[PDB]
Structures are given as structure tokens and as C-alpha cells.
Amino acid sequence: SQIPASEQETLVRPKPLLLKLLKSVGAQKDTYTMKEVLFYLGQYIMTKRLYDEKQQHIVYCSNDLLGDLFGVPSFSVKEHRKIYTMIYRNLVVV
Ligand SMILES: CC(C)(C)NC(=O)Cc1ccc(Cl)cc1-n1c(C2CCCCC2)nc(-c2nnn[nH]2)c1-c1ccc(F)c(Cl)c1
């Protein structure tokens, strides 16, 4: 993995729009580890069916709050570092 374990364990405070997104899929707190944020975002992607049904490693996030927060219309889920960077746009580290 390109994401160090200590990074996955970092405690963060999502900004209000990301926080709203996480709560929409059952999150209950204001502070999270990065691994929690990522997992809830994955749940969000599945409930909103943002992944391409025929190419399930591609997410199309245009016209969804996620696309606005990430600043891209689409991404490959294999791009782990890019995804972490896009998440960082939307939080403050504890
Ligand atoms: C099913 C549960 C909810 C367990 N998936 C996740 O939490 C994974 C996840 C969460 C958020 C986002 Cl933006 C992408 C992904 N995500 C996905 C998507 C696919 C479409 C449905 C939603 C998940 N696929 C991979 C993957 N596939 N092969 N390699 N990476 C990754 C992923 C994994 C580890 C990583 F550090 C990163 Cl940065 C991203």
C-alpha cells in the first residue's frame, strides 16, 4: 500500500460539507480517523452508485457533491494517494 498505517490512523475533523456526506451513510461523530473517512466515502459511492457498473474501478462523481468536494469529474479508485489528497481538501487534522 502507498498509504502508511500511521496516516490511516490520523485523527481528522471533516469540514461541514464532507461531514454532511459521512452522516448521510450513518456516521455519528465530528472526529474520525482517515480510515473511517475513507470507508464511509466508499459506502457513499456505493449507495449513490457513482461507480461505473461496467468498469467498477472508475468513479464518475460529476453532478454529485463528491465531485465538487474532490474537484474532479471522475477518478480511478486505484489512485490511492490522489484520493487521500482529495480528501485532505475537505478536513482539518486534529
Ligand atoms: C467497499 C468499501 C466501502 C470497503 N470500499 C472502500 O472503503 C474503498 C474506497 C473508499 C473510498 C474511495 Cl473514494 C474509493 C474506495 N475504493 C474503491 C471503491 C470502488 C467503487 C465502490 C466503492 C469503493 N475501490 C478501491 C480499490 N479497488 N482496488 N484498489 N482500490 C478503493 C480504495 C481502496 C483503498 C484505498 F486506500 C483507497 Cl484510497 C481506495
Short mmCIF file of C-alpha atoms and ligand atoms in Angstrom, two decimals:
data_model
loop_
_atom_site.label_atom_id
_atom_site.label_comp_id
_atom_site.label_asym_id
_atom_site.label_seq_id
_atom_site.Cartn_x
_atom_site.Cartn_y
_atom_site.Cartn_z
CA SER A 1 0.00 0.00 0.00
CA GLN A 2 1.00 3.57 -0.72
CA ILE A 3 -0.76 4.80 2.42
CA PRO A 4 1.29 4.40 5.64
CA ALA A 5 -0.60 2.83 8.59
CA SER A 6 0.10 5.87 10.76
CA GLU A 7 -1.58 8.00 8.10
CA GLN A 8 -4.66 5.75 8.04
CA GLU A 9 -4.84 6.25 11.82
CA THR A 10 -4.64 10.07 11.71
CA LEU A 11 -7.50 11.81 13.52
CA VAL A 12 -9.25 14.47 11.46
CA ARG A 13 -12.23 16.86 11.55
CA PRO A 14 -14.14 16.86 8.26
CA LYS A 15 -15.31 20.29 7.09
CA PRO A 16 -19.13 20.77 7.11
CA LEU A 17 -19.86 19.51 3.57
CA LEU A 18 -17.76 16.36 3.92
CA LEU A 19 -19.23 15.83 7.39
CA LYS A 20 -22.77 16.00 5.93
CA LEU A 21 -21.81 13.42 3.35
CA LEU A 22 -20.46 10.99 6.01
CA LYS A 23 -23.51 11.35 8.23
CA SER A 24 -25.75 10.52 5.23
CA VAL A 25 -24.32 6.98 5.31
CA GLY A 26 -24.55 6.52 9.08
CA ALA A 27 -21.54 8.31 10.61
CA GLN A 28 -22.25 9.78 14.05
CA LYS A 29 -19.24 11.89 15.12
CA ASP A 30 -17.30 15.09 14.33
CA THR A 31 -13.83 13.47 14.51
CA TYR A 32 -12.68 10.44 12.55
CA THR A 33 -9.61 8.51 11.60
CA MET A 34 -8.67 8.74 7.91
CA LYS A 35 -9.53 5.03 7.57
CA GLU A 36 -13.06 5.77 8.86
CA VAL A 37 -13.47 8.69 6.46
CA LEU A 38 -12.36 6.51 3.55
CA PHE A 39 -14.69 3.65 4.49
CA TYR A 40 -17.73 5.92 4.79
CA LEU A 41 -16.86 7.54 1.45
CA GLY A 42 -16.78 4.07 -0.09
CA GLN A 43 -20.23 3.39 1.39
CA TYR A 44 -21.45 6.70 -0.05
CA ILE A 45 -20.09 5.85 -3.52
CA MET A 46 -21.95 2.56 -3.43
CA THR A 47 -25.29 3.94 -2.18
CA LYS A 48 -25.23 6.74 -4.77
CA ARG A 49 -23.91 4.30 -7.44
CA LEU A 50 -21.20 6.64 -8.54
CA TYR A 51 -19.01 3.78 -9.78
CA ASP A 52 -19.38 2.69 -13.43
CA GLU A 53 -21.42 -0.53 -13.34
CA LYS A 54 -19.37 -1.96 -16.23
CA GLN A 55 -15.97 -0.62 -15.11
CA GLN A 56 -16.25 -0.77 -11.35
CA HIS A 57 -12.82 0.73 -10.67
CA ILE A 58 -13.95 4.04 -12.22
CA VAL A 59 -15.97 6.58 -10.25
CA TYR A 60 -17.95 9.28 -12.04
CA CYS A 61 -18.59 11.96 -9.46
CA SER A 62 -19.71 14.86 -11.68
CA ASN A 63 -23.10 16.31 -10.67
CA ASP A 64 -22.67 14.97 -7.16
CA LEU A 65 -21.42 16.75 -4.06
CA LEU A 66 -18.46 14.34 -4.03
CA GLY A 67 -17.25 15.66 -7.39
CA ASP A 68 -17.44 19.24 -6.12
CA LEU A 69 -15.55 18.36 -2.94
CA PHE A 70 -12.88 16.39 -4.79
CA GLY A 71 -12.66 18.92 -7.66
CA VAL A 72 -12.76 16.27 -10.42
CA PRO A 73 -15.48 14.77 -12.65
CA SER A 74 -14.12 11.23 -12.28
CA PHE A 75 -11.23 9.20 -10.88
CA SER A 76 -9.79 5.71 -10.79
CA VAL A 77 -10.18 4.04 -7.39
CA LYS A 78 -6.67 2.64 -7.83
CA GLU A 79 -5.24 6.12 -7.34
CA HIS A 80 -4.96 5.87 -3.57
CA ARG A 81 -2.64 8.80 -2.97
CA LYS A 82 -4.70 11.08 -5.23
CA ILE A 83 -7.83 10.08 -3.31
CA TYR A 84 -6.18 10.85 0.04
CA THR A 85 -5.10 14.23 -1.33
CA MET A 86 -8.65 14.99 -2.49
CA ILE A 87 -9.99 14.02 0.96
CA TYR A 88 -7.44 16.33 2.65
CA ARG A 89 -9.03 19.31 0.79
CA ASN A 90 -12.06 18.74 2.96
CA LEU A 91 -10.81 18.44 6.53
CA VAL A 92 -8.59 19.85 9.28
CA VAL A 93 -6.17 17.50 11.07
CA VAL A 94 -6.51 17.25 14.86
C1 LIG B 1 -16.39 -1.32 -0.32
C2 LIG B 1 -15.63 -0.41 0.68
C3 LIG B 1 -16.63 0.57 1.33
C4 LIG B 1 -14.95 -1.33 1.75
N1 LIG B 1 -14.56 0.25 -0.07
C5 LIG B 1 -13.76 1.20 0.41
O1 LIG B 1 -13.83 1.72 1.53
C6 LIG B 1 -12.70 1.60 -0.55
C7 LIG B 1 -12.82 3.00 -1.14
C8 LIG B 1 -13.25 4.07 -0.33
C9 LIG B 1 -13.33 5.36 -0.87
C10 LIG B 1 -13.00 5.58 -2.21
CL1 LIG B 1 -13.04 7.20 -2.84
C11 LIG B 1 -12.59 4.53 -3.02
C12 LIG B 1 -12.50 3.22 -2.48
N2 LIG B 1 -12.09 2.17 -3.30
C13 LIG B 1 -12.84 1.50 -4.19
C14 LIG B 1 -14.30 1.81 -4.48
C15 LIG B 1 -14.82 1.04 -5.73
C16 LIG B 1 -16.26 1.50 -6.05
C17 LIG B 1 -17.19 1.26 -4.84
C18 LIG B 1 -16.67 1.99 -3.59
C19 LIG B 1 -15.22 1.54 -3.25
N3 LIG B 1 -12.17 0.59 -4.77
C20 LIG B 1 -10.83 0.63 -4.26
C21 LIG B 1 -9.77 -0.24 -4.79
N4 LIG B 1 -10.02 -1.23 -5.58
N5 LIG B 1 -8.75 -1.72 -5.91
N6 LIG B 1 -7.85 -0.94 -5.30
N7 LIG B 1 -8.50 0.01 -4.62
C22 LIG B 1 -10.85 1.64 -3.36
C23 LIG B 1 -9.73 2.09 -2.44
C24 LIG B 1 -9.12 1.15 -1.62
C25 LIG B 1 -8.08 1.52 -0.75
C26 LIG B 1 -7.69 2.85 -0.70
F1 LIG B 1 -6.71 3.24 0.13
C27 LIG B 1 -8.33 3.81 -1.49
CL2 LIG B 1 -7.81 5.45 -1.39
C28 LIG B 1 -9.34 3.43 -2.37
#
